[PDB]
Amino acid sequence: XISXXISXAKI
Amino acid sequence: XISXXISXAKI
Amino acid sequence: XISXXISXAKI
Amino acid sequence: XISXXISXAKI
Amino acid sequence: XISXXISXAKI
Amino acid sequence: XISXXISXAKI
Amino acid sequence: XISXXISXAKI
Amino acid sequence: XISXXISXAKI
Ligand SMILES: [Cl-]
Ligand SMILES: [Cl-]
Ligand SMILES: [Cl-]
Ligand SMILES: [Cl-]
Ligand SMILES: [Cl-]
Ligand SMILES: [Cl-]
Ligand SMILES: [Cl-]
Ligand SMILES: [Cl-]
Ligand SMILES: [Cl-]
Ligand SMILES: [Cl-]
Ligand SMILES: [Cl-]
Ligand SMILES: [Cl-]
Ligand SMILES: [Cl-]
Ligand SMILES: [Cl-]
Description:
- The structure is a homooctamer.
- In chain A, 0% of the residues lie in helices and 0% in strands.
- The first copy, chain A, is low in regular secondary structure.
- Chains in contact: A-B, A-C, C-D, E-F, F-G, G-H.
- At the E-F interface, loops of E face loops of F.
- The structure holds chloride ion (CL) (14 copies).
- It is classed as antibiotic.
- Keywords: antibiotic, teixobactin, teixobactin analogue.
- It forms an octameric assembly.
């Protein structure tokens, strides 16, 4: 589905 | 400065 | 002076 | 969702 | 400096 | 549903 | 700086 | 389905 998500580490 | 970046593996 | 800043780890 | 936030340690 | 942060309105 | 977002203008 | 960003319309 | 996509324009 949607994997990984968002933390701030990359964005 | 900028370290890392986007590969598609997470994003 | 300054210490830290914004890395993405918190923001 | 929201995780962490500003304390002063980094910011 | 680091001003405002989030309200929830956009995020 | 999903509303708002971030452009960089504010955040 | 940080521009473009995300609303869900594309991403 | 999923439309729009990641193009590199924003990400
Ligand atoms: Cl991220
Ligand atoms: Cl990284
Ligand atoms: Cl990535
Ligand atoms: Cl940070
Ligand atoms: Cl908080
Ligand atoms: Cl902090
Ligand atoms: Cl907000
Ligand atoms: Cl914004
Ligand atoms: Cl905007
Ligand atoms: Cl745009
Ligand atoms: Cl988008
Ligand atoms: Cl369109
Ligand atoms: Cl664009
Ligand atoms: Cl994109």
